[PDB]
Amino acid sequence: FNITWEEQLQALSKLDGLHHPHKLEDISVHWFNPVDISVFVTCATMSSHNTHYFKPQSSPDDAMVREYVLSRIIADNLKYVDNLYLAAGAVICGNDEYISDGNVVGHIADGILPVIEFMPGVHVDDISDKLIKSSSYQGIFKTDNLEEFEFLVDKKNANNVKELILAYTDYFANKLAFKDPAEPAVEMYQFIDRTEVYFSFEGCHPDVEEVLFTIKIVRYNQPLNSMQVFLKNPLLSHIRTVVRQ
Amino acid sequence: QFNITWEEQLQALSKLDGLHHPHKLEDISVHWPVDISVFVTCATMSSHNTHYTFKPQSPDDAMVREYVLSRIIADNLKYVDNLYLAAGAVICGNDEYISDGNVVGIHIADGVGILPVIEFMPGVHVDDISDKLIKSSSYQGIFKTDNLEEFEFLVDKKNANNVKELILAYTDYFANKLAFKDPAEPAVEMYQFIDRTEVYFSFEGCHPDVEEVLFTIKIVRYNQPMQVFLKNPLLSHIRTVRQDLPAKFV
Amino acid sequence: RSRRRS
Amino acid sequence: RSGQRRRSN
């Protein structure tokens, strides 16, 4: 159908802390198979014209899935709430070799290797099976402990990433608080080559049933300080990618 | 400023011997001191646009069209039968030889859904961009084009056959299907870097509608034909993406 | 409407 | 010409 920036900004008006949003515009949503019971929406902006998006538990509706368009972009605009926003700015500026795009930071000099990804609108519990199958085992990650952040991240950026994490935790627990408090979900998955820890949060909004946001640290089997026999190869800065047609 | 129509394009591409299955064509939209360099921008939906920079040789809205044609034909030289199928030899002649239509690479992962060895470069010639490479390279060399013994040098023997046949097929086309009155000799130059060896095969050909057509293919051979750096799976995690804003937090 | 960590 | 003639030998 047709949401307008009036409804978007009306929903974002009740997100505490945000004071500098990026440019929004009207979209056009179009949207379901009875097999597997899935509604995959898509909608057309006018400056990017590419966004597609869940498994419902009730009879769909036009008004129904716009609650979810608001769930997604409400979850996205959380990255601009100031304390969280430049709480990420601190981890990016805190290292001269952390390159960003607004959604993931982490090489190479050619005209990026993920270290931490911002995943708005999703939760680890909703995708947990695909990781429990693929992971060697699972672990727990104490958020208040600085040493674990000294494990996944080097001691240079451990603190910044830490109170970035519990910055999101405080924001969801106090500015997106439900009447019945929601506990944050932190889940560790060990792989053969890396270590993936997920920090997922649910938040209360009046216009939406729920808001979801998770952040993923990946700490590879190799240290950043060592391994350098691999990163010093200038074949890195010689690779790009393109279509395979 | 003006609007070429695509039949003015295929009026020039019709004079390409062997061109029987050309690319999808549309109308290019023209939009064209600083070293006297001239920049011309071509808008077309699709793919929306593109741009070219070149030396002015007094420019006008009648010769810039000649330029953009001189490169349209140059690119369409990769679908004339006898050189396209010769490419297909080089892509199908290896399991991990991925192609883009402009470059080819090896291994790697999409993740979402390469490493240049052969870059097809239309609208270029090493003579015009040499001086930027002699300074950056340690030294230069010769590459005997009609002999393979060096094609085993640049690429393994699994691809030296079809690579040699490809570049020599380009040589045959440019020397026999677009030959000048005084024939132009192909220019093949090799440059040795500290991490790789780059070779460029450059050809000039005569077309009735434009002053000249040129085409170069670059093939780079790295110092290793170990090479288990290609087996590290951290390279299966690499993506590409950086907004800038005055932010002060101190 | 029509939570994970209960 | 019309600027050409690079390697005519």
Question: Within this chain, do residues A44 and A159 fall inside the same structural domain, yes or no?
Answer: no
Largest CA distance in chain D: 20
Q: Count CA atoms closer than 13 A to B246's CA, side-chain side.
A: 0
For residue A58, the distance in angstroms to the closest alpha carbon of chain C comes to: 6
For residue A113, the chain B residues in CB contact (below 8 A) are 234, 237-239
Chain A, nearest residue to B102 by Cα? A242
Strand partners, A189: A138, A196
Task: Inspect the interface and report whether the beta carbons of C3 and A182 lie closer than 8 Å.
Answer: yes
CA–CA distance, A198 with A217 (Å, rounded to integer): 7
Task: Inspect the interface and report whether the beta carbons of B211 and D4 lie closer than 8 Å.
Answer: yes
In C, residues 1-6, which contact A (CB 8 Å cutoff)? 1-5
- CB atoms near residue B246 (< 10 Å): 4
- Return the SS3 of C4: coil
Question: Within this chain, do residues B227 and B239 fall inside the same structural domain, yes or no?
Answer: yes
For residue D9, the chain B residues in CB contact (below 8 A) are 185
Phi, psi dihedral angles at B102 (to 5 degrees): -120, -35
Question: Within this chain, do residues A121 and A242 fall inside the same structural domain, yes or no?
Answer: yes
- Nearest to residue B182, comparing CAs of B202, B197, B204? B204
CA–CA distance, A119 with B188 (Å, rounded to integer): 50
Q: Which chains touch B (3 or more CB pairs under 8 A)?
A: A, D
CA A172 to chain CA mean position, Å = 14
CA–CA distance, A171 with A59 (Å, rounded to integer): 33
Please, what is the Cα angle at A185 between A166 and A55, to 5 degrees? 125
The residues, any chain, with a CB within 8 Å of residue C4's CB and separated by 6 or more, are A123, A125, A126, A182, A185, A200, A202
Phi, psi dihedral angles at B163 (to 5 degrees): -65, -50
Question: Within this chain, do residues A188 and A205 fall inside the same structural domain, yes or no?
Answer: yes
* Beta carbons of A181 and C3 less than 8 angstroms apart: no
**Burial bucket for residue B90 (CB in 10 Å: 0-12, 13-18, 19+):** buried
From the list B127, B184, B211, which residue is nearest D1 (CB)?
A: B211
Question: Within this chain, do residues B116 and B206 fall inside the same structural domain, yes or no?
Answer: yes
Task: Inspect the interface and report whether the beta carbons of A200 and C1 lie closer than 8 Å.
Answer: no
For residue B217, the distance in angstroms to the closest alpha carbon of chain A comes to: 17
For residue D1, the chain B residues in CB contact (below 8 A) are 211
Pairing mode of beta strands A51-52, B29-31: unpaired
- Return the SS3 of D7: coil
Question: Within this chain, do residues A63 and A88 fall inside the same structural domain, yes or no?
Answer: no
How far CA A193 is from CA of A223, B141, B232, D8, in Å, comes to 12, 42, 9, 57
Pairing mode of beta strands B213-222, B118-122: antiparallel
Q: How was this structure determined?
A: X-ray
* Beta carbons of B98 and B116 less than 8 angstroms apart: no
Question: Within this chain, do residues A26 and A86 fall inside the same structural domain, yes or no?
Answer: no
Cα dihedral sign, A70-A75-A76-A82 = positive
Q: Tell which of A52, A81, A110 closes a domain.
A: A81
Task: Inspect the interface and report whether the beta carbons of C4 and A200 lie closer than 8 Å.
Answer: yes
* Residue B101: domain span: 81-250
* Beta carbons of A205 and A74 less than 8 angstroms apart: yes
Touching status, chains A and C (3+ beta-carbon pairs under 8 Å): yes
Question: Within this chain, do residues A174 and A225 fall inside the same structural domain, yes or no?
Answer: yes
* Beta carbons of B154 and B201 less than 8 angstroms apart: no
Question: Within this chain, do residues B197 and B152 fall inside the same structural domain, yes or no?
Answer: yes
Question: Within this chain, do residues B152 and B36 fall inside the same structural domain, yes or no?
Answer: no
Chain C, nearest residue to A186 by Cα? C5
- Nearest to residue B187, comparing CAs of B172, B200, B196? B200
Question: Within this chain, do residues B64 and B111 fall inside the same structural domain, yes or no?
Answer: no
- Nearest to residue B119, comparing CAs of B141, B90, B95? B90
Task: Inspect the interface and report whether the beta carbons of B184 and D3 lie closer than 8 Å.
Answer: no
The residues, any chain, with a CB within 8 Å of residue B18's CB and separated by 6 or more, are B80, B81, B82, B173, B177
Q: Tell which of B38, B54, B80 closes a domain.
A: B80
For residue A99, the chain B residues in CB contact (below 8 A) are 241-242
* Residue that is written with structure tokens 């399991």 in the block: B95
Q: How many structural domains comprise chain A?
A: 2
Give the 3-state secondary structure of chain B. CCECCHHHHHHHHCCCCCCCCCCCCCCCEEECCHHHCEEEEEEECCCEEEEEEECCCCCCCCCHHHHHHHHHHHHHCCCCHHHHHHHHHHHHCCCCEEECCCEEEECCCCCCCCCCCEEEEECCCHHHHCHHHHCCCCEEECCCCCCCCCHHHHCCHHHHHHHHHHHHHHHHHHHHCCCCCCCCCCEEEEEECCCEEEEEEEEEECCCCCCCEEEEEEEEEECCCCCHHHHCHHHHCCCCCCCCCCCCCC
Question: Within this chain, do residues B211 and B194 fall inside the same structural domain, yes or no?
Answer: yes
Q: Is B125 on the interface with D (CB under 8 A)?
A: yes
Chain A, nearest residue to C2 by Cα? A58
- Contacts for A127-135 with beta carbons within 8 Å, 24 or more apart? A128/A187, A131/A189, A131/A196, A132/A189, A134/A189, A134/A191, A135/A189, A135/A190, A135/A191, A135/A196
From the list A99, A220, A241, which residue is nearest B234 (CB)?
A: A220
Q: Is B65 on the interface with D (CB under 8 A)?
A: no
- Return the SS3 of D9: coil
Please, what is the Cα angle at A224 between A148 and A234, to 5 degrees? 160
- CB atoms near residue B19 (< 10 Å): 19
CA–CA distance, B215 with B174 (Å, rounded to integer): 9
- Nearest to residue B125, comparing CAs of B74, B192, B50? B74
Q: Tell which of B51, B80, B109 closes a domain.
A: B80
Task: Inspect the interface and report whether the beta carbons of B239 and A99 lie closer than 8 Å.
Answer: no
Q: Which chains touch A (3 or more CB pairs under 8 A)?
A: B, C
Q: Count CA atoms closer than 13 A to B120's CA, side-chain side.
A: 24
Pairing mode of beta strands A195-203, A185-190: antiparallel
For residue B115, the chain A residues in CB contact (below 8 A) are 235, 238-239
